[PDB]
Amino acid sequence: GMFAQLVAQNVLLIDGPLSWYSDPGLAGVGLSYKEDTKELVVAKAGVYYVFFQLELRRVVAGEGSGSVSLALHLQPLAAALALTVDLPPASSEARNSAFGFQGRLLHLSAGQRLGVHLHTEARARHAWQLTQGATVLGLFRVTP
Amino acid sequence: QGMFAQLVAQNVLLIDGPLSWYSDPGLAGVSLTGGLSYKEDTKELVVAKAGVYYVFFQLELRRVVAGEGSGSVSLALHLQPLRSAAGAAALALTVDLPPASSEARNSAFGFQGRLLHLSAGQRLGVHLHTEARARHAWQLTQGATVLGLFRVTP
Amino acid sequence: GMFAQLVAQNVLLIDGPLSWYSDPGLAGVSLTGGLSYKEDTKELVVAKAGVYYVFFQLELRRVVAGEGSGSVSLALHLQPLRSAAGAAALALTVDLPPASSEARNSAFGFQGRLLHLSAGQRLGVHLHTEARARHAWQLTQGATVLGLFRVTPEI
């Protein structure tokens, strides 16, 4: 009931909620993630510092332009955390990567279910992807 | 007690000066006091108990008239009254306003976090400075300019 | 308390490991815990093991008008690798746009994760750059920092 960090399984840019798996870099050490409805549920009530980050890679040279948003929602049914990252159009000496980070203090009641939904608005949507192991959701409590 | 805090600015217009703050309504309704009090007259945020804290603020803008808007806006957190020799801020943040274009976004976001040593009663002020042409074209989006901290020592 | 924060000495972008000094903004309490900085290896060693919230940041400024184009990367390495995990524990690349009409003249980046640090692990940061006019930018001094603190100290 102290902290939790997990990584997204998704790679392709498709609108909808992301499935996650526990951070393998944190294995050798009390919040749960239901695999069916892809929700992280908080065990103990408290004020947590919740944060996610998102890195994107361009996979097709010379294609892809738009933006990609990532919203965390108190579930069930604005968003608590909101992160939209820009995808630059392709050119010589243009970036092939993009990143965004955001953290905030959220009050989460005991049993509150969290959900993160990925939205994209981009021409040639297939030209960008989520880098494996780089879009992370984490949180830890600061007040019992 | 946990001794935490988080506020969000009432300011929208890009006008140089200190920001007005109010407590996070999403945290209104927690038992702990939250060791940080916003005094309304001087637009300062005094810290209750001394200690070491992770302090962060974020900034988000929207372009509110299409076509214009170019430059940057900066957020500066100063321990007040100023008692340093360099005059630098304890926390700074600069986000840039992209000019209007086809296939160009109408948002800007920035986030920065550090560890501060704030003594008991220390007053903090957050100042906004813009170096932007046609700055009336962008504003701080409602509820997005946030400042928060929490203590990392008992 | 088990926490630490470092400020980089470097301003000129050369590829290699950044050299640090303890953030004066916390001098009233020093570097409480057991975390110490080793100048010869430019690494910060971890005393008490456990899970930490780690973060670095990075701000660059164009210091020659009309020049400078590319991208710089910042990488945190955990030495030695624990369970083959430690290389690029935190990675962060930010681009430096070409100078042009109303173009960006500064660039910033932030990242923060929960890492499980072992007792005796060294933390190093490497700055790698890919720029056409490498000198036209540089690291704003005092702005590229690396800090951390513990949430739980289970071995």
Numbering used by the authors:
A (entry chain C): 90 to 118, 123 to 170, 176 to 242
B (entry chain A): 89 to 242
C (entry chain B): 90 to 244
From the paper:
4-1BB is not expressed on naive T cells but is rapidly upregulated after T-cell receptor engagement with cognate MHC:peptide complex expressed on antigen presenting cells. The 4-1BB binding partner, 4-1BBL, is a type II membrane protein of the TNF superfamily. The two leading molecules in the clinic are utomilumab (PF-05082566) and urelumab (BMS-663513). Consequently, we solved a series of structures that help us understand the structure–function relationship of the 4-1BB/4-1BBL signaling complex and how therapeutic antibodies could perturb this system.
To address this question directly we crystallized human 4-1BBL alone, determined the structure by molecular replacement, and refined to a resolution of 2.95 Å. SEC-MALS data showed that soluble 4-1BBL was trimeric in solution. Concordantly, the asymmetric unit contained three 4-1BBL molecules in trimeric assembly, with residues 89–244 visible in the electron density. Importantly, the 4-1BBL trimer again formed the canonical bell shape seen in every other TNFSF structure to date excepting the pinwheel 4-1BBL structure. Much like previously solved structures of TNFSF ligands, 4-1BBL adopts the jelly-roll fold typical of the TNF homology domain, with the inner and outer sheets of the beta sandwich consisting of anti-parallel beta strands A′AHCF and B′BGDE, respectively. While the structural jelly-roll fold of the protein core is well conserved between all three protomers, differences in conformation, discontinuous density and elevated B-factors can be seen in ligand loops A′B′ and DE suggesting a high degree of flexibility in the absence of a binding partner (inset). Analysis of binding interfaces with PISA shows that each protomer buries ∼1440 Å2. Comparison with our receptor-bound structure showed that the 4-1BBL trimer does in fact retain the overall bell-shaped arrangement in the absence of receptor. Specifically, the A′B′ loops in the ligand-only structure show varying degrees of disorder and variation between all three protomers. Hence, we believe our 4-1BBL structure represents the native unbound structure given its agreement with 4-1BB/4-1BBL complex as well as other structures of the TNFSF members either alone or in complex with their respective receptors.
